């Protein structure tokens, strides 16, 4: 608090002078190797430098596909134990990985994973490395591949849940109308009958929901998914289908071994609406009845 | 002298912090351009960094033919008015130019000249850019060309004088047994009858000296060099030739219009040794006499 403030200012010139002085030495190496890496290492203690958007130098390189750079930068980080800088988030709370995925640069995505980079870190919207992949203006399971293949902290992703009422990765695929990924996840370990926190729905529920007749079949068949699973509001896929008026879908579900016996809520003593109830499509009504009385029925 | 030393330490952190902070910004540019130049500019205030041998980063690049680097480095220097760093000498008192020449990298030699780099600066031995060129384990006039062509501070070189008794560039060429350069110099302006500070000798003197019959002829003929020129010790080429015992050379000189009339020093009243005197070769003696009495003689 007194003229002892000097010790503070002088101390800075100590550990710092070495910095500026280290560069000077590294700059001499670059003059005998033309190796931009060495010249980049000299400023190692700077790769953490943010910007107007809070993007580290490595953050920008991934943004402008400067693959050449990302190569070097990562080298410096890896060979310096500073394997933490590769996680610094920008103002949007995005990590280098996050971007490599958002930009679709699968090549880089793999590279980052090799050295640190926790794919568990969510973004401003609460989406992890995987979650982001499962999305795309057009779609691309190619990303999900890089992740799944190699990466110790990668196996947990296929069990997380996004901000939006926590829709596990398996749920996302269905919402992404992409069975390609659906298999990718489940195959490499993934709870098929996962129950999300919103309405306790499952893959089949969202499938029948958006009437993804394709996914629905693919799920109940190959994926050996549980056909009769009730949601939080007590509803099986055979319900949503009938309600929405999805003939072929209802038919497919029925054949899949869908028990017509089910009651969501009132129209022990506690019965309620059944599949054969909520239906505004003449076609749907028919099958529901015919398939009920005929073949196995009191 | 009192706890006011603080202002000193704190001040350093002022103008310097911007440095380390500038790099940080330049390092962000490199992450969006992969341009090593920008990353090199960020450390501009370091290109002056010496080393164990006192070699600047640009000094090393020229040493290890890192042409790629030299390209960038010079750009930074040029576009920063720091056109003085390109003159910093190493421990051997050598400038970037000096090396570009010593290493024979003609390409670089030209490049340096374009931006500053005073070819007038001598080295540990007192040799300028030109002086060095006029030398080589095998020889190379290709260097002298780069210099002569383009370069405002280049025209003065062809009038300087090396440490060794100041032997002007024209003298060097003769000592380099290279008429190629001899012409190169004279053609682009160069005193032919230049008299060095040692023995006041001239091109012809050194020519006849090392008996460069080739140069001798080339000099007295095309170069229209003065045939009868006495040194400090009062001696014309016709002297040295006779003394050494160079028949054809003496003959060539004679025909060149070499006046037999000449006296160095005693064997108004003040006569001394003449060409026809100092001679241990029977052959030489003959011509000297025959050519004297015969054709024009009292």
UniProtKB/Swiss-Prot annotation, chains A, B:
<feature type="repeat" description="ANK 5">
    <location>
        <begin position="199"/>
        <end position="229"/>
    </location>
</feature>
<feature type="site" description="Cleavage (when cotranslationally processed)">
    <location>
        <begin position="20"/>
        <end position="21"/>
    </location>
</feature>
<feature type="repeat" description="ANK 1">
    <location>
        <begin position="53"/>
        <end position="85"/>
    </location>
</feature>
<feature type="repeat" description="ANK 2">
    <location>
        <begin position="92"/>
        <end position="121"/>
    </location>
</feature>
<comment type="function">
    <text>NF-kappa-B is a pleiotropic transcription factor present in almost all cell types and is the endpoint of a series of signal transduction events that are initiated by a vast array of stimuli related to many biological processes such as inflammation, immunity, differentiation, cell growth, tumorigenesis and apoptosis. NF-kappa-B is a homo- or heterodimeric complex formed by the Rel-like domain-containing proteins RELA/p65, RELB, NFKB1/p105, NFKB1/p50, REL and NFKB2/p52.</text>
</comment>
<comment type="subunit">
    <text>Component of the NF-kappa-B RelB-p52 complex. Homodimer; component of the NF-kappa-B p52-p52 complex. Component of the NF-kappa-B p65-p52 complex. Component of the NF-kappa-B p52-c-Rel complex. NFKB2/p52 interacts with NFKBIE. Component of a complex consisting of the NF-kappa-B p50-p50 homodimer and BCL3. Directly interacts with MEN1.</text>
</comment>
<feature type="site" description="Breakpoint for translocation to form NFKB2-IGHA1 oncogene">
    <location>
        <begin position="56"/>
        <end position="57"/>
    </location>
</feature>
<feature type="repeat" description="ANK 4">
    <location>
        <begin position="165"/>
        <end position="194"/>
    </location>
</feature>
<protein>
    <recommendedName>
        <fullName>Nuclear factor NF-kappa-B p100 subunit</fullName>
    </recommendedName>
</protein>
<feature type="repeat" description="ANK 3">
    <location>
        <begin position="125"/>
        <end position="157"/>
    </location>
</feature>
<feature type="repeat" description="ANK 6">
    <location>
        <begin position="233"/>
        <end position="262"/>
    </location>
</feature>
<feature type="repeat" description="ANK 7">
    <location>
        <begin position="271"/>
        <end position="298"/>
    </location>
</feature>
């Amino acid at each position: 608090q007194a003229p002892e403030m000097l010790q503070r200012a002088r101390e800075y010139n100590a550990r710092l002078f070495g910095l500026a002085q280290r560069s000077a030495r590294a700059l001499l190496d670059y003059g005998v190797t033309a190796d931009a890496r060495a010249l980049l290492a000299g400023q190692r203690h700077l790769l953490t430098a943010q910007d107007e958007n809070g993007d580290t130098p490595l953050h920008l390189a991934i943004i402008h596909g400067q693959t050449s750079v990302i190569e070097q930068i990562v080298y410096v980080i890896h060979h310096a134990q500073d394997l933490g800088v590769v996680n610094l988030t920008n103002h949007l709370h995005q990590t280098p990985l996050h971007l490599a995925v958002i930009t679709g640069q699968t090549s880089v995505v793999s590279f980052l994973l090799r050295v640190g980079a926790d794919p568990a870190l969510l973004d401003r919207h609460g989406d992890s490395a995987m979650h982001l992949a499962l999305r795309a203006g057009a779609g691309a399971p190619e990303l999900l591949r890089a992740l799944l293949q190699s990466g110790a902290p990668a196996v947990p992703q296929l069990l997380h849940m996004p901000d939006f009422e926590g829709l596990y990765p398996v749920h996302l695929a269905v919402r992404a109308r992409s069975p390609e990924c659906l298999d990718l996840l489940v195959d490499s370990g993934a709870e098929v009958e996962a129950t999300e926190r919103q309405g306790g729905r499952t893959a089949l529920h969202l499938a029948t929901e958006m009437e993804e007749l394709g996914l629905v079949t693919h799920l109940v068949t190959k994926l050996r998914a549980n056909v009769n699973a009730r949601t939080f509001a007590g509803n099986t896929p055979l319900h949503l289908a009938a309600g929405l008026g999805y003939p072929t879908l209802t038919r497919l579900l029925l054949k899949a071994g869908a028990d017509i016996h089910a009651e969501n809520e009132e129209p022990s003593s506690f019965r309620g609406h059944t599949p054969l109830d909520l239906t505004c499509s003449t076609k749907v009504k028919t099958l529901l009845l015919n398939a009920a009385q005929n073949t196995m029925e009191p």
